[PDB]
Symmetry: C3
Subunit: 223 residues, 3 copies
């Protein structure tokens, strides 16, 4: 069932990428870079999850299963998602690449701390986990602080769309560290099968879902 679920995930990611390619042919005032980003995220995630379906993207550490392919996925896909968010706030204005790369730096560190925490035992696990959570808090502060102020400077309609997308992303992202802690990698209150379902359903909304809401909103500012 675990294998079948991952095949299904990869196929949905493929259909996501195809949809975003079609949208790109009729760009409606949205730069090609934002369509490229929306295509790479699902394609990369699909390939990583395919490696799990084929039983290559995991190994047995001590007496627990590490799905390391998830981290290979997230270390590319999550920074690209934060880029898409930042570029949404900056739509019709000057780009602030310093703020954008600050988010990329924080995000990559967040994902690495998660991978190391999964490979750690005892107290050490929760030291790394904690550093990742602090990284996520700072990303949220930027998202609702300076980045939201840039969105406001680009007009009411854009700011309203940015706020909607920011809440959508924020809501989904806080679920990842929560699920991680409750599942086998953490306290082990939740079963493997449960965690797998969560890390199949969340990414679908986090990747393909986010980009639909994000791109449709921007295309609507053109009509």
């Amino acid at each position: 069932m675990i294998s079948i679920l991952h095949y299904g995930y990869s196929f949905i990611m493929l259909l996501g990428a195809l949809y975003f390619y079609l949208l790109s042919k009729d760009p409606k005032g949205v730069p090609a870079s934002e369509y490229l980003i929306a295509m790479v995220i699902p394609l990369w995630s699909g390939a990583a999850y395919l490696s799990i379906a084929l039983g290559q993207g995991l190994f047995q550490y001590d007496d627990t299963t590490i799905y390391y392919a998830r981290y290979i996925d997230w270390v590319i896909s999550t920074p690209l998602l934060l880029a898409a968010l930042a570029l949404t706030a900056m739509f019709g204005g000057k780009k602030n690449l310093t703020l954008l790369f600050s988010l990329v730096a924080l995000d990559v560190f967040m994902i690495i701390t998660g991978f190391v925490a999964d490979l750690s035992i005892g107290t050490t696990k929760y030291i790394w986990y904690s550093l990742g959570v602090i990284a996520l808090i700072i990303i949220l502060v930027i998202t609702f602080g300076p980045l939201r102020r840039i969105a406001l400077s680009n007009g009411t309609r854009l700011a309203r769309h940015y706020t909607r997308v920011a809440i959508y992303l924020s809501a989904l992202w806080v679920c990842y560290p929560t699920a991680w802690l409750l599942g086998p990698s953490g306290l082990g209150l939740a079963q493997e099968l449960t965690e797998v379902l969560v890390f199949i359903i969340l990414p679908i909304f986090s990747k393909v879902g986010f980009s639909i809401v994000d791109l449709h909103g921007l295309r609507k500012l053109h009509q």
Copy 2:
């Protein structure tokens, strides 16, 4: 023989980099970035192949030359960049198209490394994904990228078409040799595959850049 051949490869790469450095001192209207790219490719490839000569860049009932993938994951995207920048010579840069090719290429090389580590059907799933990546790269090369070259004048477009065919012809050889050799069906011997992955890169790296840079320098007059 395998070790000696790899030393010889690294030495030729060094001579290539030195030649491109000399050319850069008299740039003839070609941006410094295109000279830098032409220098990095051979130097990085030389270092990787050196690791094979010293017997570090491989591990073993089949021998995997993993240093090749470390080479290609840096050198091949840089080659596609040089190609893209050739199409865009004198006109506006389209970085979205350029980075699309870098994305496709890096994926192609990773699928190859995973296929080499895979057994049975799984090997050919990964191999297939890499081939599809190469097909799309070729479609971009002869489609949108060629249309940009045409928009920059007949002289530039003619040079671009020549370099595009040159690269395309050499690149299709890599997946073909991979499939026929030990990593695939095993119809060809290890020694044969080694010779191929010595001779092809010399024409793919040092050779491509000579044809590419000389053509662009000629457009100065």
Copy 3:
């Protein structure tokens, strides 16, 4: 002792990053990118050295201890330091990104050759070491050649500050390959404890120290 020293290092790095964040609030004509770079260097280095303190960032190769976390540190931190140096030479003028990325390329190769040399035995070790030294020589030629000429073109006061920071960095950087050769990774004339102290004290002056001298000099040009 070795563990405690690494904890102390990480804490000092944290304080360095916090100081540079405060400075950034009153930027005094220094671009935000240069403040971000000064913050990332210590934060990344601190995290890497923390992995050593927890005894994760090292392993036993035959009869020697390899501190591989150092290389994970340097492969990110050293290119960013050369960027800060290059951006100093270019302060008030056009950026030359080709020259900047040439330095990044050389530096990354330098650090990789070092990691491979540490994993090598006999003559092979010193082949890789040699390639890294030649990389460092070319970096020094660029620093005091074309990069210094760019600094001159941006006025006497800037050029004087650049020359001071360039010498400071150059003096500290030549110490790394020297210590490497004399310590366990090389001829083994120096003991592990000695090498550890060197690779605690040097980075503090190389990272937090360099950025203080660099940023204070540039802030002074505002007045």
